[PDB]
Amino acid sequence: TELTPDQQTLLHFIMDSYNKQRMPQEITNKILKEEFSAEENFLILTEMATNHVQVLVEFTKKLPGFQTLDHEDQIALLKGSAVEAMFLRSAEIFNKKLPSGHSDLLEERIRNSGISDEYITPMFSFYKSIGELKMTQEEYALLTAIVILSPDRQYIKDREAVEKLQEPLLDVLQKLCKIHQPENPQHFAELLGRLTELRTFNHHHAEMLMSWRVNDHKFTPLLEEIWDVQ
């Protein structure tokens, strides 16, 4: 097994948008420059989260077979996968120890941002755990697209036209788990485990938004939208 010429473009067509757009230095630079207060921390995290929802719409914008789906379906998808994609994007940073990530300081602002404790633990655990998989950019990009195009989402209409888009990507991930990882079969099944864990965080998150909302904590118009009424 290797990769048919049809699946050889799914890896490129996807791995392109994944590098085509990154986060502005003016923003990610604040993690370091700015002060370290519970407000300034929370404010900066809000900024990234908001700026990231754009990259998402852009990245998810392309995705072949996407603009074909019903408009009342692309929304459900972007809304149900917003937080999971975001969570998977941050995991890459803390794990890839990217320079523009400032993970050492980032982890600071995160821990001190009004975030409850119950949800601060699982969060990093997922990070250390997923981290151990030594995933490759190709695994991140495909897994993300897989997350975004998840039929099982809520308020969906044509749940059958989604599986016809995710299944192809899912098939291209396994092939890689047989090509770049033969020594261990379970790899693919290791990565799919991350789909259920990410989902666990959506649940934790809906709650950590409430704690925030009651504390006079507001979010941008864009995030309010994607996460429903703030």
């Binding site: 719409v57 914008k61 408009h71 929304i75 972007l78 809304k79 118009p221 864009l222 939208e225």
Partner: peptide
């Protein structure tokens, strides 16, 4: 309800 996201998907 979807004004901002719909807009972003039509740019």
């Amino acid at each position: 309800d979807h004004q901002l996201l719909r807009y972003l998907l039509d740019k």
